[PDB]
C-alpha cells in the first residue's frame, strides 16, 4: 500500500556526519513532499525541513539549516537527510513522513535510530537483587552499545518477568530485570538471570543468592 | 517562535466523548495554521489522524473529527475506544515552520485501575566492592501509567544522582518503571534510611530501608 521504509541504526562519533534515507512505496514521490522529524526520548517532536522531490524544494527550520542537507533522488525514489558536526544532543529517533497540502504526515516511517557517543563497546557488569511472593531482580550495569537480552533460567521462567528500558548513566546504559516467584519457590529452586550483550560477545549467568 | 500548548493529560472511558485542544502563544489558531493531529503508540508507531485542521487521513476512523474551537484547533473522539490510549500531537503551520504541541497522553480506562506494586532493592555487595552503590526501585502493574517518583535519603530530598524510565507498557496493559540512585560506596555509608516514594493518581506508595 503506501509504504515508507527507513534506514537502519546508527551509531555515530562526535565530529562525525551521517546520511540517512527514506525510500517511497505505494505512490507519485513527485507529488509529494518528504518531511523529516526528530524525536529526543524527552523533548518532544521537532520538525528538521521538508522537500519537494518533483522540483527540489526545501523549507528548513532555522535551528536546523546549519546540521542538515536534505535530498531526494527522484529515479531511485529516496530521500536523504546528511547531519553534520553530530554532538550528543543530535541522538534521537529521526522519522520521514508524507506529506502535501496543509499536511506533514499521514504516513509514517519507522524511525531511525542515531546515538552519537564517544564510548568504546563495554561489556555489562551483572548484580543480583536479592531482598534477602518475593520478586529478585538482577542489574546490567555500564555497557555500551545497546542491546542486551535477559532471560531468566534459560528462558524457563517467562511469566512475572519485567525488563525495563535502559537509562544512560555517564556515556554507559544500565537496565534491570525482575521476577516475581511464589515465596516457597525460593531459595529450594535455584533462580539465575542471564545476560547477553552480543556487540562484546558477552553471555554471563547471575544465580540469586539470599543475603 | 510560537509555544503551541496542549493538556498534559485526560482520561476518559470506551463510549464516552473526549475533546483535546491545541493553542498558539501567538494568539488564535486560524485555517491557514492547517492544524495537523497525529496519534503515538508504543514502540514508535506513529498515524497521521487529522490534517488540515479538519480532513481524517486515509483510514482514520470516522470518530476522530478535527475543528477550531473558538480560538483554538481540537480533537474530539466521539465514542472512545480502547485502543486510542496513545499520545496525541499537535503542530501548526506557522512562519513556514511546523510547530509542535507537547502532547497530550489519553487514558482510555479499558480496565480498572491499578496501584504500583513496588519493590526496593538495597546494593549487592559485589557492586559494593567496587565503591559503588545502586539502589534499584521497580514500579510495576499500575494504570493509569502516569507516576512520579521521589527518593529521600535519611528525610532529605534526592535530586542529584537519579534516574527514572519513562512508563513502558507491560503485557497485560498496565505499566511499569524503574528508578535507580547510585552513591558511591563513602556516600552510602554515611546515611542510614532510603526511600523511593511513588505517587499514582493522588495517593504514595513508599518503600524505605535502612543500612543495618
Ligand atoms: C512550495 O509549496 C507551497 O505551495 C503549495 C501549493 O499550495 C503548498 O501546498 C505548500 O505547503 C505544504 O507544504 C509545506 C512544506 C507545509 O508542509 C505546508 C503544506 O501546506 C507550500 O505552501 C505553504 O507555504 C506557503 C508559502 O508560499 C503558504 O504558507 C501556504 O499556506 C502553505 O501551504
Known amino acids: 500500500e503506501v509504504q515508507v521504509q527507513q534506514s537502519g541504526t546508527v551509531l555515530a562519533r562526535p565530529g562525525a556526519s551521517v546520511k540517512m534515507s527514506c525510500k517511497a512505496s505505494?505512490?507519485?514521490?513527485?507529488?509529494?513532499?518528504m518531511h523529516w522529524i526528530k524525536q529526543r526520548p524527552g523533548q518532544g517532536l521537532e520538525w528538521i525541513g521538508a522537500?519537494?522531490?518533483?522540483?527540489?524544494?526545501?523549507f528548513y527550520n532555522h535551528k536546523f539549516r546549519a546540521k542538515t542537507k536534505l535530498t531526494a533522488v527522484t529515479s531511485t525514489i529516496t530521500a536523504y537527510m546528511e547531519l553534520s558536526s553530530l554532538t550528543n544532543e543530535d541522538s534521537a529517533v529521526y522519522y520521514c513522513?508524507?506529506?502535501?497540502?496543509?499536511?506533514?504526515?499521514?504516513?509514517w516511517g519507522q524511525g531511525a535510530s542515531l546515538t552519537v557517543s564517544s564510548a568504546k563497546t563495554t561489556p555489562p557488569s551483572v548484580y543480583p537483587l536479592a531482598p534477602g511472593m518475593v520478586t529478585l531482580g538482577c542489574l546490567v550495569k555500564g555497557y555500551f552499545p545497546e542491546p542486551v537480552t535477559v532471560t531468566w533460567n534459560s528462558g524457563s521462567l517467562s511469566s512475572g518477568v519485567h525488563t525495563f528500558p535502559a537509562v544512560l548513566q555517564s556515556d554507559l546504559y544500565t537496565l534491570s530485570s525482575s521476577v516475581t516467584v511464589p515465596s516457597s519457590t525460593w531459595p529450594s529452586e535455584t533462580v539465575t538471570c542471564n545476560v547477553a550483550h552480543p556487540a562484546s560477545s558477552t553471555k554471563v549467568d547471575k544465580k540469586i543468592v539470599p543475603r | 517562535q510560537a509555544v503551541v500548548t496542549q493538556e498534559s493529560a485526560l482520561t476518559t472511558s470506551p463510549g464516552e466523548t473526549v475533546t483535546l485542544t491545541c493553542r498558539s502563544s501567538?494568539?488564535?489558531?486560524?485555517?491557514?495554521?492547517?492544524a495537523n493531529w497525529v496519534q503515538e503508540k508504543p514502540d514508535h508507531l506513529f498515524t497521521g489522524l487529522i490534517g488540515?485542521?479538519?480532513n481524517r487521513a486515509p483510514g482514520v476512523p470516522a470518530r476522530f473529527s478535527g475543528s477550531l474551537i473558538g480560538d483554538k484547533a481540537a480533537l474530539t473522539i466521539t465514542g472512545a475506544q480502547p485502543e486510542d490510549e496513545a499520545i496525541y500531537f499537535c503542530?501548526?503551520?506557522?512562519?513556514?515552520?511546523?510547530?509542535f504541541g507537547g502532547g497530550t497522553k489519553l487514558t482510555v480506562l479499558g480496565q480498572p485501575k491499578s496501584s504500583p506494586s513496588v519493590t526496593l532493592f538495597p546494593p549487592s555487595s559485589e557492586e559494593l566492592e567496587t565503591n559503588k552503590a545502586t539502589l534499584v526501585c521497580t514500579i510495576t502493574d499500575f494504570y493509569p501509567g502516569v507516576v512520579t517518583v521521589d527518593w529521600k535519603v535519611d528525610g532529605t530530598p534526592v535530586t542529584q544522582g537519579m534516574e527514572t524510565t519513562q512508563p513502558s507498557k507491560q503485557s497485560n496493559n498496565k505499566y511499569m518503571a524503574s528508578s535507580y540512585l547510585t552513591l558511591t560506596a563513602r556516600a552510602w555509608e554515611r546515611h542510614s534510611s532510603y526511600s523511593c516514594q511513588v505517587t499514582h493518581e493522588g495517593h504514595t506508595v513508599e518503600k524505605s530501608l535502612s543500612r543495618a
Open positions: 501567538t494568539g488564535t489558531v486560524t485555517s491557514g495554521n492547517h
Open positions: 488540515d485542521t479538519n
Open positions: 503542530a501548526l503551520w506557522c512562519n513556514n515552520h511546523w510547530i
Open positions: 522537500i519537494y522531490p518533483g522540483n527540489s524544494a526545501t
Open positions: 513522513t508524507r506529506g502535501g497540502h496543509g499536511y506533514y504526515g499521514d504516513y
Open positions: 505505494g505512490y507519485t514521490f513527485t507529488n509529494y513532499w
